[PDB]
Symmetry: C2
Amino acid sequence: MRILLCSVGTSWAVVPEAMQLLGSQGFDEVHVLTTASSKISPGVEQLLRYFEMHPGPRFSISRVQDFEDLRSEQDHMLFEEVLWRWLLQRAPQAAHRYICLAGGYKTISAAMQRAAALFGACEVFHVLCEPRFGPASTLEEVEQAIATNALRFVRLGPEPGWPQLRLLSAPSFPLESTLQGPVHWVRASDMRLRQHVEGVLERSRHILAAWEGISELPIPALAAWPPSHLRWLHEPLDPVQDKAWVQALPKVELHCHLGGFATHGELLHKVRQEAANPESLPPVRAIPLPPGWPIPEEPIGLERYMRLGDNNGSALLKDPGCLRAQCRLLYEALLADHVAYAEIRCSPANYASASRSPWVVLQEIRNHFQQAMEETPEDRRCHVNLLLTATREEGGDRSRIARHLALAITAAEHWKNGCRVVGVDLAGFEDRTTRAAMFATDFEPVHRVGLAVTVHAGENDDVEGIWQAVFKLSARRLGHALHLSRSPDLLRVVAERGIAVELCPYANLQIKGFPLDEEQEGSETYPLRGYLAAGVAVTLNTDNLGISQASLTDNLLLTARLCPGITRLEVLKTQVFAAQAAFANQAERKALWARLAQVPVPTDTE
Amino acid sequence: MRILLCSVGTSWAVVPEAMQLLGSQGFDEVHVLTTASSKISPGVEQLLRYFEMHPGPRFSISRVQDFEDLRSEQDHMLFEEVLWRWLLQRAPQAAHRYICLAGGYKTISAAMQRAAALFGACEVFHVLCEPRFGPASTLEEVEQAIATNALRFVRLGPEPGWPQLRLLSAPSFPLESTLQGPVHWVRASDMRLRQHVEGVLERSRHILAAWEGISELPIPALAAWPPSHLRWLHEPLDPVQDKAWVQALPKVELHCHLGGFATHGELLHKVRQEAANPESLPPVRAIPLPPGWPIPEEPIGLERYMRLGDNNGSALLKDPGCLRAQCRLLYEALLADHVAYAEIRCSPANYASASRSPWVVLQEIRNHFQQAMEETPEDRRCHVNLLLTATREEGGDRSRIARHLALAITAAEHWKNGCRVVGVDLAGFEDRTTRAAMFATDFEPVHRVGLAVTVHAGENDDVEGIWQAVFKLSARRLGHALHLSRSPDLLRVVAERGIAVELCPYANLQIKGFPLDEEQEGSETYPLRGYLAAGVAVTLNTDNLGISQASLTDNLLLTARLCPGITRLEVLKTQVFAAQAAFANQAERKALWARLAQVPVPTDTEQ
Ligand SMILES: [Zn+2]
Ligand SMILES: [Zn+2]
């Protein structure tokens, strides 16, 4: 197959001369684009007459409707778009597409070659004839010109096109044609093809501009962003102007307690009113929040923080209806926060009763979350995985811990799809009596069945606890752990081994307290920026959605006030770190990475 | 500023009409490019007169030498080069470009728009004049056209250009311009600008084509490869045809023993001749290699493999000259194999004498490697780091282990640059009563000082040892972990925790005897492909360059015979895994990544 596409102007003789580029071999078919002007109807009929007395290849003299003369830029734009559709329709394959530049206006030939470059062409050429004819314009003059070898062919060279423009097909952008005899009259209903081409070229420019430095982008899909947007990422995050952008971000939640979600306000009452046994509901205790909540004047400490959530949890979630409401409302909050992957921490043995074993509670929690996931479309679905919290308490009791670890080992094998149990969370009481090595023997069965481990080291400013968690419990993640910089060896080990650090900005500020909205960083600042500079995989989390009274968006924005000059690219980097640190399998991680590629487009850049 | 660029054919009147695109303000500069045809000279004179009157803006008429008539493709390509260089020189800034395509041939106008789209242009426009003049071609007709508003402008739209094409400058691609009055006659010395532009567009097409599957490429620089080369990457590796390509690869070595390098032959002889005390050299023991070496008919086992290296090691490297020769020759072998990063395992206490403490020996080893490194250019330098091997022994002897661990702890903080000690290797004799957990107490200081641990599983078919290495010794890498698949939980843990598996193809074949050139798979194959499919970070190493008689290239090519249908992209993946698993710091890792981005170009991508 060899198809020749040739525009024609007043000089109809260009097409028969362009027919002779390949010599006696000729073209399998030639298709001619034409305008609607009346100055070229004699040329069109002469072309038809020449085609009649040189038959064998397919012929088309398709004329562009509503295009008489170049009045303004709109005529050129319409002609270009109709050219693109006609080129797709008549020469679907660029491997054998021959394009002639002779006919038409100067802009017509320039658009001919521009379309050749955009979509690809086997050869782009121009035909010239020596001016030694007349008393070629007529049939006999053209025949004499070809017989006497009076044709010059300048081949501008083959055009490879563009990778994502060569796959465009005629059905995607159809060209409506009205027959007026042996001549087609073509028109276009819209400018879809031109808009698609311009968007493609803009994206190609963005990718090629961001190509040098793609390894520094946490999300590779960001290379298609405009350079202004990429410069916007490296700017410091603005906590008030980036509310919408952070809100729309697909986020990863790795440290969220189920029992600390609907602890006060309207959510607590919504959970309570769904109880299956309202007469067994405990009275709502008066738990006054510290003034300025969620940003207290003075840090309140771990004891007061945990007491703030006394209205929900073991007291409330022993009711099956309260538990179901808690799970469904937590999933609704996750969907409202655009969380794409979440790991929820629960204590099923804390909610067990005489007739409801901890396995029953865990199965109910998992099924509630699975039903919530299934009721949600794939595009905006939040995948929820379960971590079981092994709480260590002052006193030495270890039977609830044994129940929780055994429950995790059983559930890790039970559910292989959907909501899964993916790890254990060693949490509870901070002291040198309840450090990691004390429970290092308890977690050998957890390591045998390939269950991941995360460890709270929140309150105790004890480097030894973090070291024991990393090396005696084989913890893959560390909860809080705000004093890694105290031991440079420990910080280097955490960064080298890929152990993720779960930071909870609002909860850390409420419990510990950090300098806020400071222009300079030193000796007291939130360690997020230093951890990132040290190569630590840092994740930002909510800890307790209810007690802290802040969502994931609020925590991400509070990182702007906690760390001076933290860039929003660093927010994306924390999201990527959390995606990598998730206790997810290959399918879950693939879905999460597909979700993370859809970074919201910023507004009011520069 | 606003600079106008125009072409002139037989109708010189296009330029005066094009000067009125903006209106009464006009353009600050009006530059004219045309050919050397004799039919243009009257038009050039008319344009010169029209530039003499209205002396407002700056003018320049450029005539293209060596171009008279559009005869063939050579004329068009020469004109294109003159156009590109003239556009770069006259209008350096794309935001100040107003390119008119009214004049010249059809190809000239098409080249006008092509150059505008390539290097960027603030406006591309065409001017049309009504035919109601004449009996505009003369000065009076042109003036009447300007006054009576008979011109139409078709502004094709601004051209952004290409990001790496609009940064080009005139000095890089100058024009040979000669003056014949007020007219410039310009010509191009060669075709350099076209070659640069074609290379840029070809690379851009390659990047955009591979943009979709860029997350599937272990090295991001591979997206600039031609699509045929990337389809070649996914084809199975050919041990015979891909020899040169694998040899040219920048490689990472993570499992290479210093004492098993010059164990026989010319290298052993050279290490012996470099002895400082030749009279104290032990006699060369008669150690016949198994037939078919390096590929024996049957596996020989770990005992025979270790006995193959009896001519070197402790018995020979106690001599300072022999040690220096061994280190320098090992570095030269690493350079000849294009290894970019290496971790050499040594046992300094094995080579210590009465007057030479293990610290002296380790310092000498480190200084020899650092001197070898410093004498190599940075672009070719192989960074060498040292791992100290704590060899486990039956009978409970643990003084040498204590010495090696203490030596590693001291040396880890001693050297912060160049060659440095970065970890410990737990090797030796693996039996049920030598398992990893037996030594968890010994390695607490190593974890305290943040030294990485690799566990050297050897002569065993046990998964409990691997489990204890992972969870009791906190091993970051595992050597010869050829039985991970037998425990699915252990394989999942190894893949999930990012624990690298150090595979030594030739050594594993020689010690355990995996099948070669088998049809597809099954119950005996080298577990490399199975590990890769399970998400395990797999690295391919030499183990002992001397005992195995194989370089890193030889092992990489042997993986093609060991694992049927393994793709060379998986070889690149193993290199990336070794780079990620190295016990390197930020600077070493950055240099290693820079060296890995230079993947050799394939040669046989024609099928
Ligand atoms: Zn917590
Ligand atoms: Zn070895």
